[PDB]
Design a binder for this molecule. Sequence first.
Ligand SMILES: CC(=O)N[C@H]1[C@@H](OP(=O)(O)OP(=O)(O)OC[C@H]2O[C@@H](n3ccc(=O)[nH]c3=O)[C@H](O)[C@@H]2O)O[C@H](CO)[C@@H](O)[C@@H]1O
Ligand SMILES: CC(=O)N[C@H]1[C@@H](OP(=O)(O)OP(=O)(O)OC[C@H]2O[C@@H](n3ccc(=O)[nH]c3=O)[C@H](O)[C@@H]2O)O[C@H](CO)[C@@H](O)[C@@H]1O
Lengths: 480, 486
Amino acid sequence: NINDLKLTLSKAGQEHLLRFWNELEEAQQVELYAELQAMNFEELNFFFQKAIEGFRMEPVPREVLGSATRDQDQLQAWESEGLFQISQNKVAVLLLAGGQVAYPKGMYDVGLPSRKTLFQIQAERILKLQQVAEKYYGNKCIIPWYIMTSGRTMESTKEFFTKHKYFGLKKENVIFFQQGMLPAMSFDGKIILEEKNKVSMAPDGNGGLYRALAAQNIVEDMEQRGIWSIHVYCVDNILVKVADPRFIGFCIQKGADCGAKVVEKTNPTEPVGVVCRVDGVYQVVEYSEISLATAQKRSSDGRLLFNAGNIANHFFTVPFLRDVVNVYEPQLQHHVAQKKIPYVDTQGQLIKPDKPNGIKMEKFVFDIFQFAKKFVVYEVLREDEFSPLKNADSQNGKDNPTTARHALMSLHHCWVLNAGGHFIDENGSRLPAIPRSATVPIQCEISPLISYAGEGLESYVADKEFHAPLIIDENGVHEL
Amino acid sequence: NINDLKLTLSKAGQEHLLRFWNELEEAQQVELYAELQAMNFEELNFFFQKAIEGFNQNVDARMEPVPREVLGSATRDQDQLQAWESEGLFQISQNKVAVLLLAGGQGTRAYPKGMYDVGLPSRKTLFQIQAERILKLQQVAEKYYGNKCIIPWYIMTSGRTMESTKEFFTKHKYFGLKKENVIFFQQGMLPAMSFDGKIILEEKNKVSMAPDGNGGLYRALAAQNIVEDMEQRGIWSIHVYCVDNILVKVADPRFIGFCIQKGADCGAKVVEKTNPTEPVGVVCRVDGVYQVVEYSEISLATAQKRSSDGRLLFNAGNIANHFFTVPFLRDVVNVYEPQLQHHVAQKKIPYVDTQGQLIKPDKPNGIKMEKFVFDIFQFAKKFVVYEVLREDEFSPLKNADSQNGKDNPTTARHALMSLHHCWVLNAGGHFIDENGSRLPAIPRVPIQCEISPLISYAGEGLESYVADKEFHAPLIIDENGVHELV
Ligand SMILES: CC(=O)N[C@H]1[C@@H](OP(=O)(O)OP(=O)(O)OC[C@H]2O[C@@H](n3ccc(=O)[nH]c3=O)[C@H](O)[C@@H]2O)O[C@H](CO)[C@@H](O)[C@@H]1O
Ligand SMILES: CC(=O)N[C@H]1[C@@H](OP(=O)(O)OP(=O)(O)OC[C@H]2O[C@@H](n3ccc(=O)[nH]c3=O)[C@H](O)[C@@H]2O)O[C@H](CO)[C@@H](O)[C@@H]1O
């Protein structure tokens, strides 16, 4: 009934979306029909009005902040609690892989000696933890893997996992669900058409996880499995400690329903959100929203006042995710981005604007921190846990495939030295820990199945010397 | 003669160098003779003997953190900044400050690193930006004490760069400086030497040579009489700095006033090291004497050691920015330099075999010896350390086989723009959309901003060009004023 739809669009001020209906082959016009019939126009106008209608900080109290380095007298207790939580099948992990090289970032092969993709590395960190848990508690156990993907990448991501046999995990325990979308809209409040037959659409931000969880009953799935803790994380960090027993133990022990892992920000303009509290309410002030004066404040000790860098690693309990889906979600606000958005004009010409065209609305995953009953912050070291792959080209600065590769290999290289091993050149001369910039860097990779975080390596490496590239995996020690 | 040389080579066991002598054209024979002639074979044998001991069969155990009593900070002590800076500008006005650039190293994208063009909207090379900061300080000190003044630029070159460099300055009219004040001198060299202690020929007529390390600065000063040229100019302070740092604050008045005000003969500028494996030397004290333990000579356990406050115990990263008083140099050049030791590196050295065949080994076959410039800190009457922030003063441009995602031309470009972008927001300025929507300080596009040292040395004096004005990047602010490249 397209008479019914022309009418509801025109009342919403969007009849221009059918401007070319008569120029579309029957196939075309049914793709557009079903795409429009699936939009909540009343709601999009409300969202637009609040977005358009749009237009002091304090560090968290030391009482809520734990440190992997300063509270090392506690790492053991925390690690035991997380492995214990894992062995009880009480822990699940949720990967934010929406909004993706026009391919899923988890497929990125960084040039590691073993050529593993980010998806595989993550899967093996999950397999490892299941195995360490069993070794320490005796029972077989499961850490389910919830993967939120975008429409464009759902099928391709699934095929990729089938091709790789789920990296050794069971399909039964990997749950794929997709993120929602939102249309781009010009400054006049009209939805933008990408083509004569397609609305310019984009993922609703990683904060669209909440509406996505709801739409596919993911929480009920977690409840059915009896999961208590969810480790939410970003796909681009090759160093990500998936289901990290320490971070989780910490949160369980401090009785939190919500936690965020953090690293110290030292460069005032590093594009990292900053965890803090405003009017007693916890949140992240996204880097694109801090003033330079604040980003630059320093405390007595010489460091930045706002130095708790969000590395997009959160802990959420299931009942809390339950409250968010059932109550808080509608209260989250859209963060706005003015963008140059390709569009078909009224004259049927395809335009690539040079002046920002309209806005993109996104919800942020960390905006539910303000609703948590008990929020904690966990600080870790950068070199051990955070090396984001943000831009594939090495000409956008850092955070590219080659910095991620060296970040992982440098870490593994240090695990070997700390476990008593050494690297040598062709004559058997020992290389130093940081060899001169050719007056290699050392190629080293250790499978997560062998070492989750540097432990269990003495029997393979103590007092031994290796010629890089060195890989230590399930099949032993190999110098390529 | 040749039996002169020939005999010297035999006492030395370096006879094989004339192996191809009777097979060289007159031109070739003169090139080699000259090369061999400028070499101290008996000494080289002694250096090799000392360098090779480094393999036999421990500084780390004796290393101690820099004590608080010698450490000054641009952050923790900003209240003393105005004083240090005017003190520094005073020395510059008094004509008592010279700058010395270490540029005998190479670069390969094969040419002087100083000649690199990083993609800045102005396109200036590192050499130019430095000369402009030197020009700047001269205008500022004049327009602050009333007299014209000079910051002489001594530039240590190597057999590699010398020619290329000189021609480049001449081509650019010394960027506005006066050539009588840009003193080029040449660094010495050392031959590659195999493990058996034999000097390596790279051609039948060419000894395989390389610059003797930035520490080769000291014999270099004595050879070309540089210390005397400095004394004849009435220079008291010398700012020694690395060529590859695009943010380098040449003849930095604050750093200079700090050391002079604290009465030092020697000072090092450092930045906080946070990553254990960052390749920067670390300033430290060993047996009551200051040293820099180079990144390649520290153990991982030391590099990773933390202090109670959570930062690296050895966090004073060396940025190759030093302060030496001319008298201290005096003593170094003619009293202490013989105690400097060579740091060694095993290398794969292309060589010519006994039958004339050029070979490229797949295994290291010899060593390279180098002296390091900071190894004189230990001889100082009073050593001082001055901590400064990375983003304002340190963004190294290293060789391609030493970047690995960073410390490259593009990160160097991003560091100068980010700094200038920030200097602008701090002076009340703002950047905007094509629609004029004001951009955040850190948009989610790398805001291209470039301010000339002539307009601003460290972010000062921009209020007029910038307070309360919005700008369209890319933005360039130079002598000819404010420019928007659209
Ligand atoms: C909103 C948010 O989290 N911002 C954080 C994110 O910012 P940043 O802006 O860098 O990254 P993005 O929010 O765009 O993306 C981060 C993660 O979110 C996912 N994603 C993104 C958009 C989307 O619609 N759907 C989706 O699932 C990506 O797959 C990725 O896993 O990482 C930084 C660390 O590197 C943190 O310091 C920032 O505070
Ligand atoms: C010996 C030395 O200074 N090491 C420092 C240098 O090491 P790094 O390894 O970076 O560099 P190099 O020791 O090769 O020397 C860098 C500087 O020295 C010059 N040069 C080098 C060799 C030579 O024979 N002649 C010469 O003039 C180069 O032109 C450049 O100006 O910079 C780092 C900062 O990035 C510091 O943390 C290191 O402690």
